[PDB]
Amino acid sequence: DYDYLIKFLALGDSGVGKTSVLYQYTDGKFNSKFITTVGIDFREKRVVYRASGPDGATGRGQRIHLQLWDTAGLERFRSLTTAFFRDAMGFLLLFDLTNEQSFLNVRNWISQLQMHAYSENPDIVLCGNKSDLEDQRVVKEEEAIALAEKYGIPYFETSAANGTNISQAIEMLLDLIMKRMERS
Amino acid sequence: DYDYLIKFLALGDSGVGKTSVLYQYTDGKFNSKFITTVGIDFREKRVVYRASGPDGAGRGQRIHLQLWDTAGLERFRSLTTAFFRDAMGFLLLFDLTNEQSFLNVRNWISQLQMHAYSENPDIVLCGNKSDLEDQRVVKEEEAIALAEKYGIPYFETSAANGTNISQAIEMLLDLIMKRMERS
């Protein structure tokens, strides 16, 4: 917890890859078999955080203890009305680039986030996951990018399988929180 | 809506009834069929805490209780975590019908004192499944002696019919509300 203890919540429909993304990030491992998440779960990771200026000037690293919470997609919107949910400092919102319906549901997810989080405008990073399945891809990149611009949130196309953009997307979310918080 | 968010953690061997004790407490419901907890889970309840008055004196605070359920098969693994050191109090369960789960209470307490936010965290010891008297194997005197040696409260509970569940949880709540600073 050494400099800061930061907690994130991963959300999205069942099957989009939440568990696989957090597991690829913390352990660099991937499993093809679908074991759907029941209840919740979490992984922790010590990482070094390096602030970036508007010019790109990089400050000295700070030790972050990251607590990454994983949710059950089958209990869609089950209890966003808990104190647990209101303690999430930021949200990694996922959809599946091979599942158009999971992408069409992103607007509703963002709506539910803003109504139930600690703040009306919490930090969000949108991930289009499973980018490694080029032949199965159905979500149009231009439309994901347009949607991200509309809500003003970063967008990354990620793969839990091969790791592409997983660190970047989580690091961007960390950057939004570190920038936003009040310090002593 | 609430005056205090209080987080407790239930612990103990797989099978002793952690999930069932929280579920009976928050919802008044109970399921016979065993489904082992994977990872972690939680439940929440808004309660009213009226303080232990001296001389008999009132001052009821709205508590938002957050009750965390652990996977008993993960055993001592997530003791390593910042999560664990954020738990304010421990509901330590054994199975009145399982001697081995009782024999394991010593090491659970040792593990707790080694990894909690305090070397002496508040613990309430629960001998669960008191409704299965015909299958009981843990003698009340032994359980009471063990609690006395460590100085922690002991309750015999049943997640099936609710006996002593609220009393045990309110006892833990009381310990924390008296130990916390600015109350």
Binding site: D1, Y4, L5, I6, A83, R86, D87, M89, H116, A117, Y118, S119, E120, P122, I177, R180, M181, E182, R183, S184 | A82, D86
Partner: peptide, 13 residues
């Protein structure tokens, strides 16, 4: 982190 529905304590905020 201060929010209109809840202030999250960070071990600032």
């Amino acid at each position: 982190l201060v929010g209109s529905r809840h202030t999250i304590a960070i071990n600032x905020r």
